[PDB]
């Protein structure tokens, strides 16, 4: 079984809060926290881009897992936002990772594509080709910002978060999954060509309240467990809105669920990872807990992973 | 097993002479001829763009392989020029193609792209969790070309290329495979800030030549094949002079090898596919016929598959 050996993150030290936000366009900070929970975000450096990013969260993840970069068979980076098309992501941290013998290749699924990576690794794992997957979710969603739009600037963050993906002593690692997309979706939520995010937020919003819980219950079903054996869920931090019908699907308590929205906003397909640096780092997820991942995103891709913590 | 169920492609309609490029640039017929033997290459109309490419060649393989899009796993679309960056391609096509239950990424390993994808459906069908995985491999390169610059712009074509991956009665199927990347070449190949091809064509071409020819040994000898059990050679057609390397590595006879660079040029992640519905078309690969496909690509990235051809 493909399980987790460790995670590290990468978070910019640059704080936007809401009231610098209150400068910049016609927004409030009432308004956001209301209807996004956000309270502050960060913005990456203007020298400082996906690949610095990813770096840093790659080489804190190997660290905790105990693993050397030229162990690692396969780098895998979700992102949207790459230094340039080619090289791409994955391939300049091979290179500044010293990972050799790594194949390496940036995988786009929007918001769930660290999701799209820790299943595409789990096969590569499962299989016996490979040992060790590093996946990357790293997004510098300020670059992709129309920063005079009041209904996007105020959502979207950066960082950087890391898994190394391996194989764990059994009972442990991913039980379950599911992948998914609705290209039909692609309408509400796309690049422009000023490179600017275009968002039917009203849209996006009624597609993930809805499909958030849905993954989380298959997910749940299909690793043959209850409601009532998840220890803890991990939601795409996009919106407190959303994130809270996913914890009422799930009958989890408030203290059971990850919520680090209110400090990094929308970071895409960083979320995840962040905010599971972040309860381990405050020791609520232990060996032996039931995970549950879940993530939405742009073009309409979905993800959901169930996963019994440690090696 | 995982095999390959069938193959479609979309050639451009437009064709692009050495005699048209020699009133854009200052070159020679000659000069391209006896360096890459390119002696056309197709260019997309200026409404095409890679979804358009990439839902004609997905069509095509479905059809040839008996493939209803409903039936559809997986899309999976190696581009680095999808029409945006999200909605990808593949979430693109899904929708247009009618594959509801698939899900949907885009990868981006550039020249090799194409055989990343293969090999990352391989690991889903052979894990048991899906049974049919598109790959689509399309490059509208005329939008990332400088077509001023006489060092690139006689170089790159358009087109896509498509493959249905599923389970195939066993003997048949993907008998080995090599991924690799070496992100130190990251500085020969890269797009620019004006997404204009920026290339060091004499390195890239010395890294090709020897590792071409190592990853086609290398898929063989996993295969527990010999030089002799190859039946057909399909390279990355990007130059002749690199193709022919290949071709003595293996001692293959010179219509054993697939040869379309002359009238396609590099088409990138689309090459292979492209020469493979070539063959197809012609007759020349047949039921049991072992097939070596290698592949190079920007960012320094490269692959290989032996497979043996049939359901």
Redesign the interface.
Known sequence: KAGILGVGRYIPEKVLTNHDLEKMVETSDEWIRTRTGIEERRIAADDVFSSHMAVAAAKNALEQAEVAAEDLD??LVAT???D?????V???????LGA?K?????????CA?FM?GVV?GK??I??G?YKHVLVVGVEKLSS?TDWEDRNTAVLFGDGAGAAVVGPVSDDRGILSFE????????QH????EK?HTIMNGREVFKFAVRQMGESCVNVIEKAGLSKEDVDFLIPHQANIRIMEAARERLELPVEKMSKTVHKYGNTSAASIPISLVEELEAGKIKDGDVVVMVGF?????W?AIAIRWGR
Chains 1, 2 share one sequence.
């Open positions: 396969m780098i949207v936002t790459p340039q098309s080619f090289p791409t994955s391939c300049m941290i091979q290179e500044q050799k790594a194949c390496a290749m940036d995988i786009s699924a929007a594509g799209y595409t096969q590569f499962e299989s080709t992709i992948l998914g997309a609705d290209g039909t979706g692609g939520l796309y690049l422009n490179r995103g742009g073009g309409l891709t993800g």
